[PDB]
């Protein structure tokens, strides 16, 4: 109610809308380098 707002607000999206306000999928990749065993490595490398 008055001066009592839900902390969240919804979005509204329609195919007619402009590109700027169209929904987008976002992915963020972060890399960790600690004094710890490495778990992420590059792809295959091989020669005949």
């Amino acid at each position, epitope marked *: 109610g*008055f*001066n009592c*707002y839900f902390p969240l*607000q919804s979005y*509204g999206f*329609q195919p007619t809308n*402009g590109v700027g*306000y169209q929904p987008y999928r976002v992915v963020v990749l972060s890399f960790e380098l600690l004094h710890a065993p490495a778990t992420v490595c590059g792809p295959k490398k091989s020669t005949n």
Partner: antibody
Amino acid sequence: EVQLVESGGGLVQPGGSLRLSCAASEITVSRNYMSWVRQAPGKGLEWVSVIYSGGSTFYADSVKGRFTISRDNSRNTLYLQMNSLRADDTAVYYCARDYGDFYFDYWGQGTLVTVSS
Amino acid sequence: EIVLTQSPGTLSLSPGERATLSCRASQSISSYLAWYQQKPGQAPRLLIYGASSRATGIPDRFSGSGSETDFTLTISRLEPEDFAVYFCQQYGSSPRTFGQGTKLEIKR
């Protein structure tokens, strides 16, 4: 109910400085988005700046590094300082609160600002 | 920066009828405009949430209409308390802007 009371403004020669202030009757200011806008006659309103509830700020491009904004949560009062006041900026300036994406809901009585040699 | 155009230049009509305030923007948006009232020499007052959501302190006579780029404001059964100027501002992003205003006149 909720009221905004301002003061200040006025006339100073070009190149001067001016600080403004406004207090709120019931809304605490601390937990609210607060903004400043100005009206020049025959030209209309204009955005100036605003403060987010997280304490962050932003301003128009034409005034970056020139127009300042501050708050005093202890007193539910809004503080604005202006430096490097230039020509044709003479106008009435207002304090305003939002809900949602900058819906200026409640308004003060407006404060005149004037610049001329 | 996105620029609005309020239309017509002035509004002259008798009370009790319907009002029609049209507005146009430079760049197409989706339901990112609003309306602001001002009786002269007073505090501007917020009218309409989004394109068609009305504030609680505002009677039912008002109605707003919006599109991609054309947006129009409608009020019915005009009354003396309504004589004022009318303004459009963008609650989208640019950062935000406004319109040039339009004045309503009550005719006897």
